[PDB]
């Protein structure tokens, strides 16, 4: 029962960028020395929407077979117990639950992991008393928080600007990616000298906000 074991990403979820070459982890732990030729590995993908599972890759001890183009599990690594699945240029529709099934007759073990595919926002700041437009494009998922903040010499602590700022609707693109633009109207007459402003973009694909500097002049 516990002479053969499988371990997936801690946390149960892996996140990867669109078009990157992701590696879904699957580690084997056997009570005996691994003899890859007498071992079998199978990877399945299950849609989180349709709840239907498909075989994605199979390792028959002395030869592999990929059902998902480019899919591979390197043999020279499987000996170290690494049954991880490499998927070249992953796509948005490939997000889902992946399952790694290991067979070392008569023992069998498995594990599942969630793969999320994300696209980082491309934020562009452009100038039209002063209309500013911040366009962040090509991001996935849809949810995205755009904000504006300013730091005056008086109060250098960044404070959020929630006036004269209109954040437009998020439009879906053809390649499944998303778009959104936000506009801020600044009046020189009302602003302090040398204030530093910035468009702040928060999104799941970012570990820290994507900022864009600018000062009136």
């Amino acid at each position, epitope marked *: 029962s516990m002479d053969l074991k499988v371990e997936m990403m801690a946390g149960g979820t892996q996140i990867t960028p669109l*078009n990157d070459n992701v590696t879904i982890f699957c580690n084997i732990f056997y009570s005996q020395p691994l003899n890859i030729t007498s071992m079998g590995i199978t990877w399945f993908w299950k849609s989180l929407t349709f709840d239907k599972e498909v075989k994605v890759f199979e390792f028959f001890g002395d030869h592999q077979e990929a059902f998902r*183009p480019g899919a591979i599990v390197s043999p020279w690594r499987l000996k170290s117990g690494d049954a991880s699945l490499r998927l070249p240029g992953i796509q948005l529709e490939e997000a889902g639950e992946y399952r790694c099934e290991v067979v070392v007759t008569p023992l069998k073990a498995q594990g599942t992991v969630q793969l999320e595919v994300v696209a980082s926002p491309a934020s562009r700041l452009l100038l039209d008393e002063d209309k500013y437009m911040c366009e962040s494009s090509g991001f996935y998922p849809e949810a995205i928080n755009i904000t504006w903040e300013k730091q005056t010499q008086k109060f250098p602590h960044p404070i959020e600007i929630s006036e004269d700022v209109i954040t437009g609707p998020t439009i879906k693109n053809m390649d499944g990616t998303f778009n959104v633009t936000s506009c801020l109207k600044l009046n020189s007459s009302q602003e302090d000298p040398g204030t530093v402003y910035q468009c702040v973009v928060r999104h799941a694909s970012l570990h820290t906000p994507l900022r864009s500097n600018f000062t009136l002049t």
Partner: antibody
Amino acid sequence: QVQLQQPGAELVKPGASVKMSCKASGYTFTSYNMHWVKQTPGQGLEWIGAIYPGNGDTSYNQKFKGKATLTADKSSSTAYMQLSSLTSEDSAVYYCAREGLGALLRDLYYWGQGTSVTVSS
Amino acid sequence: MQIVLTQSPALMSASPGEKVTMTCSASSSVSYMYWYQQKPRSSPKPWIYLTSNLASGVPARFCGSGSGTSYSLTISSMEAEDAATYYCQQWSSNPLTFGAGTKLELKR
């Protein structure tokens, strides 16, 4: 948005060769399998094979090995299929098709308009 | 182990409004069956995938089902625009194969 452009038709001589082109656009050419399907009134739809532009991996229908060869040009996002030493039996429409991924793995979702090939003297 | 798909009947007639059922029998078991629709002088269109999911744009009157070696495509209520040829396709093992298709015509 995903588009697959194929020339309308080709008139070819018996014994000759021909290269069918398929201009792909609207998506990452190297991340999807490109398939080719033969269609003649007599045998319905027949699979020729597929190629993963990205690492060039191919899968062929045994009946076409030695007859068809799939290649790809990444720089131009174009799939190609070559038929060697043609005979009238090769006269048919040859479709270009993109296989999806995920819920659409192994499903030919997008098709080119097809190139009608006529083998004749 | 080439899997052969046998579609029956080869030709079907349906009056507008009638229920239509076409089958696809596979020589050996298959994980999933896919269907495509094709009208004269144009390329086939994905109609059904993963055995029962409709491709975007396909009318809800269509229904696909099946298991193992036996599958079917149904039309609750026939319509003129449904007259076409339907093919099943599988790829659980090489080579990918298509059924000979079922030509569905209008009945009169």
